[PDB]
From a paper:
Of the six [name]: enterovirus 3A complexes, only [name]: 3A/EVD68 and [name]: 3A/RVB14 formed crystals that diffracted to a resolution suitable for subsequent structure determination (i.e. 2.3 Å and 2.9 Å, respectively). Analysis of the crystal structures of the [name]: 3A complexes revealed that the 3A proteins formed either one of the crystal-packing contacts (as in the case of EVD68 and PV1) or contacts with the second 3A molecule when two [name]: 3A complexes per asymmetric unit were present (as in the case of EVA71 and RVB14). This putative dimerization interface is formed by the two central alpha helices of the 3A proteins, which are bent 180° to form a helical hairpin. Surprisingly, the C termini of the 3A proteins, which in the cellular environment are anchored to the membranes, are located on the opposite sides of the [name]: 3A heterotetramers. The dissociation constants of the [name]: enterovirus 3A complexes ranged approximately from 1 μM (EVD68 and RVB14) to 15 μM (EVA71). The overall structures of all solved [name]: 3A complexes are highly similar to each other.
[name] is a Golgi resident protein involved in the maintenance of the Golgi structure and regulation of intracellular trafficking between the endoplasmic reticulum and the Golgi. However, in enterovirus-infected cells, the [name] [name] domain interacts preferentially with viral non-structural 3A proteins, which causes re-localization of [name] to the sites of virus replication. In this study, we present a structural, biochemical, and biological characterization of the complexes composed of human [name] and the 3A proteins of four representative enteroviruses. The crystal structures revealed the details of the [name]-3A interaction, the 3A-3A interaction causing the assembly of the [name]-3A heterotetramers, the interaction between the [name]-3A complex and the lipid bilayer, and the roles of these interactions in facilitation of enterovirus replication.
Author numbering:
A (entry chain B): 15 to 54
B (entry chain A): 366 to 436, 474 to 528
Write the structure that this text describes.
């Protein structure tokens, strides 16, 4: 699963369905942020 | 020096599905106060290619941008600009310039009277 092609897909066809499928095939891995900073 | 690839950005019409899905899986909904800038730090994974982001808001627009912090140098990936993400979901992607940390800036600085509810989702590829 090439990274560049996963991108053209989601651009053109994007939904919860594509996202979950891409999650299923482990093409996209859910990300965990580290810090969430707050400023004024 | 390292050449930085251009980010990709787009939108998808189904906003209600996104916010519905977000609330289900986890509670991560950032409430950006008046005149506030929230920065979500998203580091790169040792074996990883791209970072994909999604974000949306309930009643109002908000500023969004993406910076990259090296391994404190800062590259500007998506310049901070106001998006109408209350109408639609906003998505985008970028290829790793190298080893570092992505800064997703949600910028409410301009808004005097209005807090913004931010639903977001992040992914990466391998």
């Amino acid at each position: 699963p090439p990274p560049e092609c996963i991108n053209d897909l989601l651009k053109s066809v994007d939904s919860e369905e594509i996202r979950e499928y891409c999650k299923k095939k482990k093409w996209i891995i859910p990300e965990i942020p580290t810090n969430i900073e707050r400023a004024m | 020096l390292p050449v930085i690839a251009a980010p990709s950005m787009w939108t998808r019409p189904q906003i209600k599905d996104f916010k519905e899905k977000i609330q289900q899986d986890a509670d991560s909904v950032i409430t950006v106060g008046r005149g506030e800038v929230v920065t979500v730090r998203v580091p790169t994974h040792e074996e990883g290619s791209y970072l994909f982001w999604e974000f949306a808001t309930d009643n109002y627009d908000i500023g969004f941008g993406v910076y990259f912090e090296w391994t404190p140098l800062l590259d500007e990936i998506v310049p901070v600009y106001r998006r109408d993400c209350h109408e639609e979901v906003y998505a985008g992607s970028h290829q790793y310039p190298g080893r570092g940390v992505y800064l997703l800036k949600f910028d409410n600085s301009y808004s005097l009277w209005r807090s913004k509810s931010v639903y977001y989702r992040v992914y990466y590829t391998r």
